[PDB]
Design a protein around this ligand. Structure first.
Ligand SMILES: *[C@@H]1O[C@H](CO)[C@@H](O)[C@H](O)[C@H]1NC(C)=O
Lengths: 440, 100
């Protein structure tokens, strides 16, 4: 037997369905998604951390001149300053008042702490989906981490489940993302080799242990102070530290649909968007014939309590006189109510209680049991709590919240005016016929 | 902050995030007088009551005006054949329907 159902991708909310055959007992299927993951494929574009300006010891030539060695280090700059008179603790270093030279040389390296305090710039694409479902079919219960790609079956006890594809391709991560301190940011970082001074990515390394480094920090050498041995320099302040000053909240705080962003791997969990289509292939072994299952008779449904709250705010009591004890796949084919229990024990004679959640002020649905179709009606009342801490289990229909009084008023306004129009039309037709027949 | 049926969460300092969802508990009573019903269905479902109520009122007014117009036209068409008689004898229509 083949089934094609579709369930909302809301984690932590159970979803119940019934399968019906021409000559077999109805069977209940309950699916509970405990965790839905979205794992994009990420490529490590590069790694950025605080830089460190390393200066070679000044090359002081007394009564002579030097030349600039060729540049090979990241952002490395060399300059020769003439007419210097350096001093040390012993005294004057040179004996010529002029024509002394000092070679100053600077470059940029990664900080010593780049192995721990660094940000990884990634490119994110090709999201995949994984669902941790508790699946109960034919009183057979399992837990599976099913991939929500359409291609892959999951098999158990002869039952095949083909989840996917996801209805919506929406993802929280954009093309370019940044990981830092276990948090994910949607940042449009510069490409490798295109970093700019004073901004994120001003220095870039392909990997945290890579031997390369692209540096762009506007390093410029200044003239040494008179009678001093040092290499003055001027740089734009670190782009990493400035970025940390102006990070903005991470994705875990700014993601839509209530997604929860995690790292290692980079995942988005429990996104309340889209729907999962499920394809079921159930062997006939689990199915039971109508004769084997108990048959219901003389059942009446009473709504002894109903509040249209988000949770199961209603109890329905059904009086039953069944042929024998057994298990019934209790279900409401309509969307008026959502049933907490997908199956109920059944005895020879008695009353059974079923917990249901409805958004209707005046509910009236067809509760389906082992074989019967009981009609259940009643009245519900607004709940105590203005705000709760769980999502609504039921679904809201367009006419769900319209009361009987509102319906009567609407019928009087729309339905009484039509009556007045009909009366006027009848009177006009009668008058016209009367005057026309009285001419001759 | 406004919390709808879709959800709303806040993080206060280092506390774990707290999530909240709304429920249909509007002021007013649907099983009551028309003003209470309008208040209940305006606090809930806004722009669906203002539009609906206005449409209903417009339809009712148009229907009443049209019914009055046809009634007046029928009265004229049933009286003028008898009205413009030089001696103005109108027993029959007044006896059968009391139009005047
Ligand atoms: C889903 O299955 C797991 C594993 O047994 C269990 O811990 C969890 O409570 C189940 N969820 C529900 C809603 O029963």
């Amino acid at each position: 037997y083949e089934h094609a159902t579709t369930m909302p991708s809301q984690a932590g909310i159970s979803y119940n369905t019934i399968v019906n055959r021409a000559g077999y007992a109805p069977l209940p299927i309950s699916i509970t998604p405990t965790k839905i993951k979205l794992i994009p494929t990420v490529n490590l574009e590069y790694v950025t951390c605080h830089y460190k300006t390393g200066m070679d010891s000044p090359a002081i030539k007394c009564c002579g001149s030097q030349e600039c060695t060729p540049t090979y280090r990241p952002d490395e700059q060399c300059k020769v300053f003439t007419g210097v008179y350096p001093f040390m603790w012993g005294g004057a270093y040179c004996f010529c008042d002029t024509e002394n030279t000092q070679v100053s040389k600077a470059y940029v390296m990664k900080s010593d702490d780049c192995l721990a305090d660094h940000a990884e710039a990634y490119k994110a694409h090709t999201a995949s989906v994984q669902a941790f479902l508790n699946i109960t079919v034919g009183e057979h219960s399992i837990v599976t981490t099913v991939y929500v790609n359409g291609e892959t079956p999951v098999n158990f006890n002869g039952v095949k489940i083909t989840a996917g594809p996801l209805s919506t391709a929406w993802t929280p991560f954009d093309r370019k993302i940044v990981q830092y301190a276990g948090e994910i940011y949607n940042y449009d970082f510069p490409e490798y080799g295109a970093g700019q001074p004073g901004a994120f990515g001003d220095i870039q390394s392909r990997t945290v242990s890579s031997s390369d480094l692209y540096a762009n920090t506007n390093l410029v050498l200044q003239r040494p102070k008179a009678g001093a041995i040092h290499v003055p320099y001027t740089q734009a302040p670190s782009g990493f530290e400035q970025w940390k000053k102006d990070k903005a909240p991470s994705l875990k705080f700014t993601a839509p649909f209530g997604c929860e962003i995690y790292t290692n791997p980079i995942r988005a969990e429990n996104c309340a968007v889209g729907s999962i289509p499920l394809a079921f292939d159930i062997p006939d072994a689990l199915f039971t014939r109508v004769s084997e299952t108990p048959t219901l008779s003389a059942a009446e449904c009473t709504l002894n309590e109903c509040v249209y709250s988000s949770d199961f705010g209603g109890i329905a009591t059904v009086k039953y006189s069944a042929s024998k004890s057994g298990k019934c796949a209790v279900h409401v084919p309509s969307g008026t109510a959502t049933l907490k229990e997908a199956a109920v024990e059944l005895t020879e004679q008695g009353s059974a209680t079923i917990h249901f959640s409805t958004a209707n002020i005046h509910p009236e649905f067809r509760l389906q049991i082992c074989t019967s179709y009981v009609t259940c009606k009643g009245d519900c009342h607004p709940p105590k709590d203005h705000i709760v801490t769980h999502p609504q289990y039921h679904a809201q229909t367009f006419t769900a919240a319209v009361s009987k009084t509102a319906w009567t008023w609407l019928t009087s306004l729309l339905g009484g005016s039509a009556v007045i129009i009909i009366i006027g039309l009848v009177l006009a037709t009668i008058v016209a016929m009367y005057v026309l027949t009285n001419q001759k | 902050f406004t919390v709808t049926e879709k959800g709303w969460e806040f993080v206060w300092g280092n506390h774990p995030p707290k999530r909240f969802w709304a429920q249909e508990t509007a002021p007013g009573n649907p099983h009551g007088l028309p003003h209470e019903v309008i208040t209940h269905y305006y606090h809930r479902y806004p722009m669906s009551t203002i539009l609906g109520l206005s449409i209903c009122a417009a339809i009712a007014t148009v229907s009443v005006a049209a019914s009055t117009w046809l009634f007046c036209r029928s009265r004229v068409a049933c009286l003028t054949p008898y009205r413009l008689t030089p001696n103005a004898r109108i027993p029959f229509c007044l006896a059968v329907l009391c139009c005047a």
